[PDB]
Each structure stands twice: as C-alpha cells, then as structure tokens.
RNA sequence: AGGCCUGAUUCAGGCCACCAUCGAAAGGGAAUCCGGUUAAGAUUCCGGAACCUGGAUAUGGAUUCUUCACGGUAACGUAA
C-alpha cells in the first residue's frame, strides 16, 4: 500500500524547518514542471504553542496558545512519515500548486492554516501534533 | 638582494613571530609580522568544518552579525545538516520503540 | 535454498538493489518483499522496518552480510537491501520466503 | 489486514 | 580610505557641519583606447574615513566643481 | 535507548492498530 | 515636537496575581 | 573556607559545588602602517592614513495590523 497520502503526519528532516511536524495536504508522486521530483505540499508548525497552567490568566493564556504555521513544498527524501493522521478537510483547498507561485495566495493559505490549527488545538484534539519533538 | 630581520623584541624563529618580506613604497624590502591563521568552526558531532560560517579569530566573532556565524536550520552553527538529520530520525524511532515496548508490557502484565 | 530463488528473481523478475531504491519503492507501494542483510547499519535497518510497517511489506532477514547477499543476488558488489517488485518466474513470494 | 511481516522458510 | 561612486553622496559629505576642506586632484592618464584624458578625484574626509570620488568626465567634474558650497575651502592638487 | 524493532512490534500482536496510529502517548 | 515634561509611574508587575494569592492565603 | 537569586513587609525560602597565591620579555595573547626628520631618538616624534577595546547616548531602518521577519526541494542565503 501507499502511506504518503493526504492527512498523513510527517516530520521534516532537512531545511530550516528540520524537526518540525507537518501534515500532508496534496502529494505529487510524479512531481511538477518546477519540482521534477516526488514531492508533497505540507502545512506544519513553525512555533509550537506553550504550555498553560492555572497561574496564567486571561491575556497571558491568549498569548501562550498562539500558533505560527507554515506551508511548504517538501521532497519525499526530506520527510519522515509517521503512522499518525490529522484531518486536512478544513484547508485542503487553499494549499495547491498555484498557491506557491502567488505570494498573496501564500498569505491567505497561512492565515487559514493558522486559524484551523488554533481551533483544533483549543478543541484539545491532536495533542501529539502540537507537541515539540525533542532531538 | 637586501636582507631584513625581525621588527619586534623576539629574536627567535618561534611560531608566534613569523616574517613576510614586502617591498614598501620607498623602494626597499622590509619585514612584516603575520598573525596566526584562523581555524574553521567544526561540527560538534563529527568534527567536519561547518558550512556557511565565516572563519575568524576567537575575538573577531564578537564584532560580526549573527547571520555570519549561524545557519537558519536548528542547531545551525553548532552541528551540520547530516548530524541533525540523524538526530531527528533517531529521536523519532526511539520514541516509537518506547511506545511499542510500553504496549508490550501492558499486554504481558494484563494476563494476571 | 533461498539463493536459488533470489537468483531466479534477478534473472526473470523485477528488483531494486540498495537502500534508496528500496525506500522509493516502499513509498510508491510497489514492493512485495524486502530482504535485509545482517550487515546493514542499525539506524537504516530500523528506518526500513518502520517503512515496511507503514507500507505493510513483508520482511525477510537475510542470514549473511551485504557481500554475501550481493553474491547471492548475482552482483560482484555489496548490496545492503533488496526489494522484490515482481517475482516473475520464481516462487519466493509463494513459499513465505 | 496483517498479522506478521517477518518471513521464514517453510521447509526448515 | 573609502571610494564612493555617488556624486550626491559626496555633496552631502561636503555639506556637513564639521568639514575642514576638500581636495581636487587632477591626473593625466591613458584609457584602454590609448587616448589620454584628464581624471578628477574629489577627496573629502568624514568622521573617521577619507572618501574619494573618481570622475573620468571633464564636464561632470566641472559641474561638480560649480556645485560645491561657496563657503568650502578647496585644495587644488 | 533502543530504536524501533519490528520483532517487538509484532510481539504485541496488533500491527494493524499500530500502522493505523492507534496508541498515541506523550512522555516527559 | 511640542512636548511637555512629566513624571510617569509604571504599572506594577504581577499585581492581580499577587492579590489573588494573598486572598487565598487569608 | 562563598557567591547569587526569589519575595504585594515575613527575614523566610532556594541554587551551586571546591579552594589562596607564585611560576614563561622563546609558550597562549585585541588593535599601526608608509614617507620624512637628529650631532646623537623612532613601528614611540612630525605629516598623512587606519585600526582595537570600553562607555553613555541620539538619528535612520527593521520589528508589516497592531506584538519577536522572510526565501530555497536541499546544501544554505539575509542589513536587521
Ligand atoms: Zn556533523
């Protein structure tokens, strides 16, 4: 079977975002004209949320739970796929091959991914995805 | 064919004082002391020279910006790319093995 | 034997020799069986095991080094891992080997 | 559906 | 010392409060074509460096000479 | 500290669940 | 830019938290 | 055998371990060159030119909706 499909969680091993957790939105096994290799569009976490305790209150909690996202085109050789999954139904339409040729579409995609990630984190779902990998 | 000598107190051919011969704008040959060459920073895991980091004397790093002595990747400026990749892969696999071992222990203690 | 089946696969079937080719075929889901030499490094072996678990690909631990596995395959160079895309004329897949 | 991935010769 | 290429940067340097004088140096030299020409170096020093502007065009050098402040002491050669 | 092993991955007897991402744990 | 000198008192740090801890303590 | 930190004012609490000093003008080490000058002084003086270290501070720019920036598959690049 194939495991590099939409919704699969991966760990980036090369590049500036090495060690960060991403989710695959659109796999391209045959590549593109601009990326002639097996690659994938991913949405990942650049700044993980900080832990919140009972001492923190109001504005501090709102500051600690902010999540910074990123959207990337990553070669398969630079990804380590996991066995975990995360739903990409909220933002599977904003991350496409066109998005990475238009910076405004990049801005909109990052905004949408940030909103979706913050909502999912505040819902308490996917505690493993929103936790830093210690390496 | 003019002969030159040291310009400082040390009269011995030590590593500290090394002489180059240069022709000054006066038309004469004169000695010049050369400083010790700088050494490239090395990776903390494999010892290979770090890529993308300028080579300077220890005290010259205090005067340059952070982009000239770091790399944008994690552990950038301390470890090279391959070592970081191995660290990530090893950490993930160790965590997975811990999960599997915990499940096995739970199953094997569930008999009683 | 197991060397005869491997030799027949190389003669008639489809195969990939090496770690990079094996991982690429595992990602593409075209692998039927992966034979792992005993000489392979532990990190690459564990990565291959995890990839096989993800892709549900059968694993056979070869009883020998990468050079013995290369000679068994029929190549005068070391091979650390072999992936069987198509058995072809041989029957290595049928006999659970 | 999978139960085992390590394989062994049947004739031994 | 430093070399500059921007003429207005030279004029801004010569317009500062703590400026002593500016030097205008003429050199007769050959180009790659072999035809000799006149090259003008305008040198003025800022806080801790001496900025030199090299102009190989006579007309541009004359315009720069005319554009210097009238209260600036100029050293010819 | 030991790396992932397929033998101990099968000793638990549940490989479909693991490959499906069933047991998720956070340590330390 | 047409300013006016004055003395500004900065807000105390961790005031509400300390008030809450004091209330629970008492 | 001693230093540091926390605290709406209650002196209470906490962290850390290990020994002065002397011993190199050939070891390690921040930074200066050219030209001129005396009866006798020069990398020291004079003229020009430049660096190092420490300090207080101001201006421009960045920190892009208001809150710690981006690009490249990657090695890596950057005025911050
Ligand atoms: Zn290294």
User: Contact A2/C56, CB-based, under 8 Å?
Assistant: no
Based on its alpha-carbon atoms, the radius of gyration of chain C, rounded to whole angstroms, reads 12
The domain total for chain C is: 1
Ligand 1 geometric centre to CA of B40 (Å):
14
Nearest to B91 among A15, A16, A134 (CB): A134
C63, C67, C70, C71: CA torsion to nearest 10? -90
Residues of G with CB under 8 A from a CB of A: 16-17
Cα(first)–Cα(last) distance of chain C, in Å? 10
Full 3-state SS string of C31-73: CCEEEECCCCCHHHHHHHHHHHHHHCCEEEECCCCHHHHHHHH
Q: Exposure of A78 by Cβ count < 10 A (0-12 exposed, 13-18 middle, 19+ buried)?
A: middle
Fill in the DSSP letter of residue C87: -
3-state SS assignment for residue B53: coil
Dist CA C79 CA A85 (whole Å): 34
3-state SS assignment for residue A116: helix
User: Contact B97/F11, CB-based, under 8 Å?
Assistant: no
Q: Tell me the domain boundaries of chain A.
A: 1-135
CA–C1' gap, G23 and H13, in angstroms: 21
Contacts of A57 in chain G (CB under 8 A): 16-17
Closest-CA distance of chain A to residue B80, Å: 11
A57 touches G: beta carbon within 8 Å: yes
User: Contact C54/A38, CB-based, under 8 Å?
Assistant: no
The domain total for chain E is: 1
* Helix ranges restricted to H, A22-102: 59-64
Query: How, if at all, do strands E73-76 and E21-30 pair?
Result: parallel
What was the structure determination method? cryo-EM
Q: List the 66-95 stretch of B: residues with Cβ below 8 A of F.
A: 90, 93-95
Contacts of C2 in chain D (CB under 8 A): 9
Fill in the DSSP letter of residue C3: H
Range of the domain at E56: 1-77
Phi and psi torsions of A73, nearest 5°: -105, 115
> Are E4 and E52 spatial neighbours (Cβ–Cβ below 8 Å)?
yes
Residue nearest to nucleotide H35 (CA to C1'): B26
Write b or e for each residue in D1-12: b if 16 or more Cβ atoms lie within 10 A of its Cβ, otherwise e.
eeeebebeeeee
A48 touches B: beta carbon within 8 Å: no
- Say whether the F–C interface has 3 or more Cβ pairs within 8 Å: yes
Count CB neighbours of E43 within 10 A.
17
Resolution (A): 3.1
Nearest nucleotide to the CA of G23, by C1', is: H8
Range of the domain at C78: 1-97
Most distant CA pair in chain G, distance: 51
């Amino acid at each position: 079977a194939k495991f590099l499909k939409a919704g699969k969680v991966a760990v980036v091993v090369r590049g500036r975002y090495a060690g960060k957790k991403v989710v695959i939105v659109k796999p391209h096994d045959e590549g593109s004209k601009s990326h002639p290799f097996g690659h994938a569009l991913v949405a990942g976490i650049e700044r993980y949320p900080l832990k919140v305790t009972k001492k923190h209150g109001a504005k501090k909690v709102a500051k600690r739970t902010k999540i910074k996202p990123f959207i990337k085109v990553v070669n398969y050789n630079h990804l380590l796929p996991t066995r975990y999954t995360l739903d990409v139904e909220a933002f599977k339409s904003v991350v496409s091959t066109e998005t990475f040729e238009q910076p405004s579409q990049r801005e909109e995609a990052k905004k949408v991914v940030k909103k979706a990630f913050e909502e999912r984190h505040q819902a308490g779902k996917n505690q493993w995805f929103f936790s830093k990998l210690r390496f | 064919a003019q002969r030159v000598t040291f310009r400082r107190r040390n009269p011995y051919n030590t590593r500290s004082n090394k002489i180059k011969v240069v022709k000054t704008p006066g038309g004469i040959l004169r000695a010049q002391h050369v400083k010790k060459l700088a050494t490239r920073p090395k990776c903390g895991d494999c010892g290979s020279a770090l890529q993308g980091i300028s080579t300077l004397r220890p005290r010259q790093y205090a005067t340059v910006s952070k982009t000239h002595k770091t790399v944008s990747r994690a552990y950038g400026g301390s470890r090279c790319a391959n070592c970081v990749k191995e660290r990530i892969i090893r950490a993930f696999l160790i965590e997975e093995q811990k999960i599997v071992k915990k499940v096995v222990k739970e199953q094997t203690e569930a008999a009683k | 034997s197991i060397n005869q089946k491997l030799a027949l696969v190389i003669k008639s079937g489809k195969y990939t020799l090496g770690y990079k080719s094996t991982v690429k075929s595992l990602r593409q889901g075209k692998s039927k069986l992966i034979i792992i030499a005993a000489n392979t490094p532990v990190l690459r072996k564990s990565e291959l095991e995890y990839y096989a678990m993800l892709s549900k690909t059968k694993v056979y631990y070869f009883q020998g080094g990468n050079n013995e596995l290369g000679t068994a395959v029929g190549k005068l160079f070391r091979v650390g891992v072999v992936s069987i895309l198509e058995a072809g004329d041989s029957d290595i897949l049928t006999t659970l080997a | 559906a999978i139960t085992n991935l390590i394989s062994k010769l049947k004739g031994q | 010392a430093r070399e500059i290429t921007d003429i207005k940067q030279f004029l801004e340097l010569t317009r500062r409060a703590d400026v002593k004088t500016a030097t205008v140096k003429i050199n007769k030299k050959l180009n790659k074509a072999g035809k000799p020409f006149r090259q003008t170096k305008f040198k003025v020093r800022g806080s801790s460096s001496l900025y030199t502007l090299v102009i190989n065009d006579a007309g541009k050098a004359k315009k720069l000479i005319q554009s210097l402040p009238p209260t600036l002491k100029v050293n010819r050669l | 500290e030991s790396l992932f092993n397929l033998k101990t991955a099968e000793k638990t007897g549940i490989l479909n669940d693991l490959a499906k991402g069933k047991k998720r744990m956070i340590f330390t | 830019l047409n300013s006016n000198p004055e003395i500004l008192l900065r807000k105390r740090r961790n005031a509400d938290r300390t008030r809450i801890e004091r209330q629970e303590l008492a």
